[PDB]
Design a protein around this ligand. Sequence first.
Ligand code: BCL
Ligand code: BCL
Ligand code: BCL
Ligand SMILES: CC[C@H]1c2cc3[nH]c4c(c3C)C(=O)[C@H](C(=O)OC)c4c3nc(cc4[nH]c(cc(n2)[C@@H]1C)c(C(C)=O)c4C)[C@@H](C)[C@@H]3CCC(=O)OC/C=C(\C)CCC[C@H](C)CCC[C@H](C)CCCC(C)C
Ligand SMILES: CC[C@H]1c2cc3[nH]c4c(c3C)C(=O)[C@H](C(=O)OC)c4c3nc(cc4[nH]c(cc(n2)[C@@H]1C)c(C(C)=O)c4C)[C@@H](C)[C@@H]3CCC(=O)OC/C=C(\C)CCC[C@H](C)CCC[C@H](C)CCCC(C)C
Ligand SMILES: CC(C)=CCC/C(C)=C\CC/C(C)=C/CC/C(C)=C/CC/C(C)=C/CC/C(C)=C\CC/C(C)=C/CC/C(C)=C/CC1=C(C)C(=O)c2ccccc2C1=O
Ligand SMILES: COC(C)(C)C/C=C/C(C)=C/C=C/C(C)=C/C=C/C(C)=C/C=C\C=C(C)\C=C\C=C(C)\C=C\C=C(C)\C=C\CC(C)(C)OC
Ligand code: HEM
Ligand SMILES: CCCCCCCCCCCC[N+](C)(C)[O-]
Ligand SMILES: [Ca+2]
Ligand SMILES: [Ca+2]
Ligand SMILES: [Ca+2]
Ligand SMILES: [Ca+2]
Ligand SMILES: [Fe+3]
Ligand SMILES: [Mg+2]
Lengths: 62, 311, 318, 51, 51, 259, 277, 43
Amino acid sequence: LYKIWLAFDPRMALIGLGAFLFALALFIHYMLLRSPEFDWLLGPDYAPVTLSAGMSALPAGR
Amino acid sequence: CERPPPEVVQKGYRGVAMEQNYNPRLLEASIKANLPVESLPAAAPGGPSVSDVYENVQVLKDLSVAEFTRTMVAVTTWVAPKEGCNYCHVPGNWASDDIYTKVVSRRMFELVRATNSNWKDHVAETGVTCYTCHRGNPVPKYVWVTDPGPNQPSGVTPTGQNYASSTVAYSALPLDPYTPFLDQSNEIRVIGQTALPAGNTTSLKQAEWTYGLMMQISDSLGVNCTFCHNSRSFYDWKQSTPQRTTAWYAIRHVRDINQNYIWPLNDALPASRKGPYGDPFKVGCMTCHQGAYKPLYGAQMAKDYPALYES
Amino acid sequence: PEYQNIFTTVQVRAPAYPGVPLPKGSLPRIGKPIFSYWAGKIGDAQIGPIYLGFTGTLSIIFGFMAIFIIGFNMLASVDWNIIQFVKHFFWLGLEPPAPQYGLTIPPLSEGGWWLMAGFFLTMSILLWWVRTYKRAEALGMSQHLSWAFAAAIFFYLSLGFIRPVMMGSWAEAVPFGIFPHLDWTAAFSIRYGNLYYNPFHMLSIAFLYGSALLFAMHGATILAVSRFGGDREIDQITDRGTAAERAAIFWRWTMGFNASMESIHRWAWWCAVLTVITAGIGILLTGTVVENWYLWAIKHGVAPAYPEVVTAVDPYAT
Amino acid sequence: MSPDLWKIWLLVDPRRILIAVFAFLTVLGLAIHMILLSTAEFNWLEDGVPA
Amino acid sequence: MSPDLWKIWLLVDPRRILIAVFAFLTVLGLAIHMILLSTAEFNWLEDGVPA
Amino acid sequence: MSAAITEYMDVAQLTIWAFWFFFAGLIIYLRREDKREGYPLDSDRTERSGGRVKVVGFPDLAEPKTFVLPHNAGTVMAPRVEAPTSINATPVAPFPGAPFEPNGDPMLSGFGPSASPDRAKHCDLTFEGLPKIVPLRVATDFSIAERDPDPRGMTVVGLDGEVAGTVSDVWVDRSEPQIRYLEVKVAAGGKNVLLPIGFSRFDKKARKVKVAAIKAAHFANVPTLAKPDQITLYEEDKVCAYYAGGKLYATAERAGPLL
Amino acid sequence: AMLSFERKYRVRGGTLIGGDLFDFWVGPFYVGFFGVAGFFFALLGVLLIVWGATIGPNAELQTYNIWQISIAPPDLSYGLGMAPMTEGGLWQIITICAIGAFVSWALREVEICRKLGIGFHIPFAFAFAIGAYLVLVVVRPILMGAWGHGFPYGILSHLDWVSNVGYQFLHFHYNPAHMLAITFFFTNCLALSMHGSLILSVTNPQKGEEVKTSEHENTFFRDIVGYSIGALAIHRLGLFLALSAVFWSAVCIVISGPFWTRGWPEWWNWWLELPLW
Amino acid sequence: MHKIWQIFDPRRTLVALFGFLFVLGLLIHFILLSSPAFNWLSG
Ligand code: BCL
Ligand code: BCL
Ligand code: BCL
Ligand SMILES: CC[C@H]1c2cc3[nH]c4c(c3C)C(=O)[C@H](C(=O)OC)c4c3nc(cc4[nH]c(cc(n2)[C@@H]1C)c(C(C)=O)c4C)[C@@H](C)[C@@H]3CCC(=O)OC/C=C(\C)CCC[C@H](C)CCC[C@H](C)CCCC(C)C
Ligand SMILES: CC[C@H]1c2cc3[nH]c4c(c3C)C(=O)[C@H](C(=O)OC)c4c3nc(cc4[nH]c(cc(n2)[C@@H]1C)c(C(C)=O)c4C)[C@@H](C)[C@@H]3CCC(=O)OC/C=C(\C)CCC[C@H](C)CCC[C@H](C)CCCC(C)C
Ligand SMILES: CC(C)=CCC/C(C)=C\CC/C(C)=C/CC/C(C)=C/CC/C(C)=C/CC/C(C)=C\CC/C(C)=C/CC/C(C)=C/CC1=C(C)C(=O)c2ccccc2C1=O
Ligand SMILES: COC(C)(C)C/C=C/C(C)=C/C=C/C(C)=C/C=C/C(C)=C/C=C\C=C(C)\C=C\C=C(C)\C=C\C=C(C)\C=C\CC(C)(C)OC
Ligand code: HEM
Ligand SMILES: CCCCCCCCCCCC[N+](C)(C)[O-]
Ligand SMILES: [Ca+2]
Ligand SMILES: [Ca+2]
Ligand SMILES: [Ca+2]
Ligand SMILES: [Ca+2]
Ligand SMILES: [Fe+3]
Ligand SMILES: [Mg+2]
């Protein structure tokens, strides 16, 4: 499908595609960091702290 | 720099932005540093009584020997685990009071017992334990003395402010709000409660002192101002949160602790327990909460030790 | 793409312009003008000469004394430690007198130095105002800048002199410090019940927001028509060209009404001036005729009411 | 300690030096007086002497 | 300490270097005195000596 | 003196109301200054009544103000009255508010983005009375900054990349030392036309001036000046407006729509 | 009506979308495709604001006092989902209408710029104001994880939101991007008064004086501060100051909560903890 | 001396000198007023 490169500048198409893919990769990595399930920066041996004796991590709200 | 999203707790009405923001990883680190100690196994009911077995028990005389022994084991873990049982006792003579730690700790028992029974407006059945402040250290980590502030030239009167201090969360606010408010009973309220002037002569400088105290309160509980206030009207109790009512009693509770328990013990304490102005290490909001909205994030340790309640 | 007229691509150098000749008996302009290349890329390359007359010289001497007193007291506050001075510099400040002194002159370290710094800074600002008045007069220009500067001075005097005198206490005035005067700003609003509900604070913000709105509109407008020589605003005012017509027509088609090349600067002048005029008035009303702005707003039906989803028991009402 | 030290006025402008020197000495003079006023042991106005 | 050390004045302007040195030495001297005044040990105005 | 004027009125309430009266008066003043140009309005309301109704809105017009131009160039009244002018276009549709289609060649129509008023037919003067916008051949003491490329000798290309000519000279503002126009020698008839700096995109690496406004063939019809070494305010508008028309008329695709 | 010099500028074309269909004028306004879309985006948003005022927070608190009218976002418990109409869903629709109206207004300015053959600085500058609004109601709420972080639509209630968000960081003045944004705002207001004064004082000179020249403008501020930026560059500077203030204001609010949760004065502990002191 | 006025402008110098003296005079009076021991406007 060479027709695409007849109508789109190869330098601008690669700059746009490269920036898009890099932005997409950064966004998806962050989306995994948002979820603690896939937050690999917590460490492979991550264990959530155990709450005992009526502990609550957060104050009560609404 | 932190990364989103924080854990947000909504306290007020929607759109009013009365919320608590917690970094989940910072919150995780704080909780791991504020874990409670597992309660000792319950003492065997019955047995000999403290009154007719021990000689110089002046506070815990209502207990049985089994519960009394359990209490001593627990306070050893809570206060002096490294120094052991001999930190508060003369070796070979338990009944001896000829050591300052024994005299202080006996008054500390009255402090805890009075707190767990008479200050439920603040500690609300969670109560306190020797561990709540000491956290396994003979000297509690977060105590305060009357701060002279930064060094000044001999002919310069200190302002007590305009100096980066962690006591006011690194603002330039008056850096020693503990002394006038958490030891003395200076008026915290500065805001006039009428639309038009009606004799409220409180200076703008006095608002900075209240602001400094509120920075220390919020830092001690790891919360922001909206945890207790609607910032559109700081004076107004009707728009505040129930935590503001608790904090009001906590201020009076801390004053009671410092004036009636810590201060009378000043003579007994060594020079290393006193500040430059000679006042002893005193109790602030940070002493128990240590950066959390509740000490040990609401862990309930006192209920397992009947020695920590008044009879 | 198209030249956006944001940076000057090619700069041209001419002999430095001495300035429009001043009338007889004026001091010669001091300084040999130089040409900064980077200043010429965004603006005019020539730096200097400056006119330093008698009034400007006196303003300098008064101004330095104020700044020196402030800095000395900042350095004294960290016990002369120059290293601690740099560390705490933003937090350092010269506090106004304590409340117990009222309007009297307290000792040096208890607000006396603040009064001297306040007075000397005020004199230099007033002297600088006279300087702006005379420079415009010497060039045959009108006194619009002096009027606008006087408006800013009025707000400055309201903050540190007029209101503290009205309140009868120097402790109400602004400390001389970076973070300390921000602490004063926050404490002022807290003390007098949420300055957001001061209607003259609301107006001041509207004009401060409007100033950024107008300069963004006007600045972008002139850059948009600069291809027609729209930056030459004097010529467009005296002899309306296509730059001024297209600029006016753009805003007429956009929002239904427009200014002229001259009157847009009257909108600009008044929006900026009203920012500090309303700022000064709102400060003078605070603490003098209104104790609590939120309660004033409640009295006048301005503060919204929210459903009571959270409330606190008042411990004083027992 | 140099017979040719007078040549410094060929390098630096004598007028700018005098302005800088006089301005610096005045500020230094004010600063030293203010340091002593900020020192209780040397504040000659608040030391109470003479009684 | 090279014999041709005098050639450095063919690279750096003597007037600018002299101004920079005099300004730096002045600010350096002020800084050291202020640091000493900040110390309890070397504040000669607040040490109570002589009594 | 108290803060309370009545049971409900207070000083702060009177002060804010006092501001609104001033602010209302101020807006009326500013709107009156706005209407010193382009008023009375041109409308079918006036056209259908035969000039009996003047459209000025509210506030009405102010009294004329005088601008005494320097070097006795005349006195210009801001709220003046201009002669009626006929546009070089026809309406696309007869309903009010409909746009107009320029007659003939749109680039040469003098309508729309290529429209321009008739400014004064005299040069803009410096403070000393010399012409302000002059070429570098007569502003001898003016020179290009050392770190910047000299525009003279650069190639001028149009919207389509076709060569239009070379920069023969640079026109500068004498009052404020900046480049205003590039004098381009058209390589079609050897006639020098001015190129405003606002329509010029310098390409320093290739020493090329890119003109996205118009094609290379359009440089032959750029309005020219009577005197080769000075330009009047009238001619400045004509030159700039011609290039501006290219932004809408140079190519068919520029009239839009995108989709 | 149209200005006495306006008729020669009313040309067909330059539309981004719609072509000849919407290319016309209504009174002074040019509508175009985005004027039609922008008007009905605005009309629906305004009508839903009035309806939100009509139902109010509840029946007892309902008010038509323009100061007290408030349309609040959802509770944070709804997250990024849609909320019921009376529980913040109205705010979500109004926000969408506002975004549609603002973008249509910006795009209508682009079409007007194309008709007049002028630069696109004005729609570009307006995009910064839109971007600041988008940060407040889209970017920051999404980063925070709930639409309830948007500010309520009310003249005074959105001030209560600003106050409480500010005190969520205990002292919002210490926000470094806030300090930078305020510096640009204050500098812009100063620069606007200076520019307005200089133009007015030159074109309206002393009594019995002729209009001054560009030399007088440059000489005037060189006599005062020793530097004159120039007649063209003051408009670059004013645009830069105004847009930088909004850019750094958008930064200051988007880092408050998403990228910083402690009190703002505590952020400066990086400087206080440098080993130099 | 006297040649000091060949390098110092008498017009600029006198204004700078008189301005400094006026500032100095104001400063000293302010310091004395601040001093309780030398404030002459008390009882
Ligand atoms: C703290 C203990 C003492 C005290 C201890 C000292 C000590 C020690 C000194 C002073 C000095 C000074 N003190 Mg004292 N001083 C005290 C309290 C005061 C009080 C007060 C209100 O109480 C005041 C107003 C002063 C004021 C003064 C100044 C007169 C003088 C600083 C001048 C200066 O800085 O010039 C700087 C500015 C200049 C412009 C310098 C240049 C001078 C002239 C104007 C330039 C031209 C010179 C001319 C050509 C010479 C011609 C000679 C040939 C004929 C050619 N002191 C207390 C009571 N004071 C200093 C002094 O004596 O300096 C002479 C000094 O060393
Ligand atoms: C302890 C506090 C004492 C006191 C002790 C002293 C002492 C000591 C001195 C003064 C001096 C002055 N005091 Mg006193 N003074 C007190 C209270 C006051 C009060 C008051 C309302 O309480 C006032 C208004 C003054 C005012 C004055 C000034 C008249 C004078 C400073 C002038 C100056 O700085 O010139 C500088 C500013 C200029 C512009 C200088 C230029 C002068 C003019 C423009 C040029 C004239 C040229 C001419 C030929 C030279 C002679 C000039 C003479 C002043 C006539 N004092 C109290 C009671 N006062 C000083 C003095 O006597 O100076 C003459 C001085 O040494
Ligand atoms: C206790 C509260 C805190 C505080 C908490 C906050 C919070 C929270 C915020 C700020 C924000 C700001 N603060 Mg702060 N701030 C405080 C104190 C100050 C002080 C001061 C003197 O003390 C100043 C000068 C400021 C200044 C600022 C600005 C930097 C900024 C607001 C401008 C802006 O965002 O533009 C942006 C402009 C817009 C968003 C306007 C959008 C325009 C839209 C596109 C068009 C609408 C069209 C309209 C509907 C048309 C109607 C039709 C009519 C007919 C005309 N703050 C105190 C310490 N501050 C805000 C910010 O930075 O946001 C980005 C913000 O959220
Ligand atoms: C319309 C309202 C806005 C506004 C307007 C405004 N400001 C103005 C003006 C106007 C119209 C002026 O004409 C005036 C000006 O000059 O502008 C360039 C000014 C001005 N606004 C300024 C600042 C300013 N404006 C601000 C705000 C605003 N100004 C408002 C937003 C702010 C804020 C927001 O805080 C500031 C900080 C100044 C730049 C200037 C007034 C300068 C002035 O009065 O200076 C007095 C003199 C001094 C302080 C000199 C001290 C510095 C010297 C370098 C000391 C050393 C000298 C020497 C070496 C000493 C030698 C030894 C001695 C012992 C002799
Ligand atoms: C970025 C630099 C500054 C700037 C620039 C700027 N603003 C601009 C422009 C530019 C360049 C325009 O060209 C454009 C314009 O046309 O100006 C006349 C505009 C404009 N800036 C405006 C306002 C404005 N700008 C502001 C700020 C700023 N604008 C910045 C400080 C503010 C502030 C700070 O509050 C306001 C209020 C308008 C006058 C206008 C854009 C008009 C517009 O978009 O019209 C469409 C919308 C309507 C006709 C009605 C609203 C429809 C909505 C659905 C209603 C709901 C709105 C909102 C969600 C709720 C209510 C808000 C509550 C807080 C009360
Ligand atoms: C009463 C009634 C009918 C109520 C019904 C209300 C209902 C139901 C709906 C209404 C809401 C709807 C649907 C709105 C649709 C869109 C409409 C009509 C929008 C109206 C336009 C509008 C928003 C106008 C607001 C303008 C305001 C308030 C401020 C703009 C900023 C301002 C202060 C501008 C004044 C200064 C001016 C004129 C600047 C422009 C200007 C600049 C900036 C130059 O640089 C320049 C240079 C050289 C020559 C001229 C100029 C020039 O004119
Ligand atoms: C080169 O400089 C050196 C190194 C020599 C000294 C350096 C000094 C430095 C680093 C100074 C730094 C200063 C800074 C950072 C200052 C910051 C100042 C700020 C932010 C100020 C902000 C607001 C202040 C205000 C608004 C003050 C207003 C005060 C007024 C209007 C006071 C008026 C007072 C009067 C008129 C006094 C009257 C006194 C009466 C009693 C008559 O006097 C007797
Ligand atoms: C019953 C439980 C407690 C016991 C046994 C106990 C024991 C002691 C002892 C032995 C000391 C002296 C230590 C020393 O000086 O080296 C002491 C001091 C102190 N305790 Fe406690 N304590 C108890 C509960 C508490 C609580 C609940 C608080 C907080 C409110 C508290 C705050 C302090 C403080 C501030 C000091 C002074 C600092 C110091 O001297 O070390 N203690 N306690
Ligand atoms: C610009 C200031 C206008 C005069 C303001 C005066 C207010 C200060 C208090 C005067 C009366 C004091 N006192 C105690 C006698 O009431
Ligand atoms: Ca903390
Ligand atoms: Ca003495
Ligand atoms: Ca010391
Ligand atoms: Ca000594
Ligand atoms: Fe302008
Ligand atoms: Mg302070």
